[PDB]
Amino acid sequence: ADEAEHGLACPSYPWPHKGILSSYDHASIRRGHQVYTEVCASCHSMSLISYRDLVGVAYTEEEVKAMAAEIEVVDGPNDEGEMFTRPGKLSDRFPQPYANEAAARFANGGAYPPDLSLITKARHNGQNYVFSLLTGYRDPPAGVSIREGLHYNPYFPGGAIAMPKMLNDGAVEYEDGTPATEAQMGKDVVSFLSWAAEPEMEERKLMGFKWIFVLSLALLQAAYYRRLRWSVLKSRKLVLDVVN
Amino acid sequence: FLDPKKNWLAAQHMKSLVKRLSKYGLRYDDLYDPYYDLDVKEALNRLPKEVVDARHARLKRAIDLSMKHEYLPEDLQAMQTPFRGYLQDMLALVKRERAEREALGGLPLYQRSIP
């Protein structure tokens, strides 16, 4: 009914990038980009993030160049009007897995795997929702048998979601030897997605702290200035020739 | 109409108005803005200069207190006459003159300017 329609509510996890002075865990961003490339890029797309966005955030410039040179993209017409494919450079966006929305829906049973660039800002309680969605592939309750071709997921609105349980224990081999479990993989991929949706978070937080402090000092000065200018008026004595 | 001496609610209302008006040292008639009605303006013109000047002094005192964020001392609050009006009779006379003038074919002696 309405409860299943709106989905089981998502808790409030203590994300490492939460707090007025808190930064992304950049090692976790690197790990999340690894897991996204390994398992999530088959169906989902980003299409808003360039390879150059990873330089200085999770990978070094030569590493990003090699990773871009791995894939090949179609480049515009040459001197004969024909089209051709060249290895991706440091400016190309992440590759798209499907030709278009129609091909995506056809490959995924009519359901369109959403673009993941702004996924954590396109859902209410974004980061917690995404983590809970990925981790909470539970056994459906009693007498609610869902149709074939879907999977039960309490957090998803309606309970029935179209993507299968992807994050499995030992799905990927992390570069730095971190033991890959479902929860760890979910944490890393959600950290990566939250960075992707908001790459300016650290600069924004630093600016906010500095300017709130500075403007607080300005507010004290402005209050003193106003009191000083008004003190010849507020501490004045007037005689008016009237009683009642 | 059962306002005075027979209505508990009206007695409470009068008590509150007395409290507030005496607190700022005003009178009820002083709340009548000349710019509001243009009949208060004529009444204030017709009133004696001593009464008008006392009204202006009370208004200036009230505005001064409102600026300073304070009230009259308890002594002057005690020596207050919030409802010793001075304007109602002249205002009623002016309104009655206006009433007859409009009743039988007359131009208004003054009109509000279009802002």
Binding site: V243, N244 | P48, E50, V51, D53, A54, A78, M79, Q80, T81, R84, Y86
Partner: peptide
């Protein structure tokens, strides 16, 4: 406590 109507000038006027 408040003065009578005659114990002023504006009040008398």
């Amino acid at each position: 406590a408040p003065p009578p109507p005659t114990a002023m000038i504006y009040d008398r006027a």
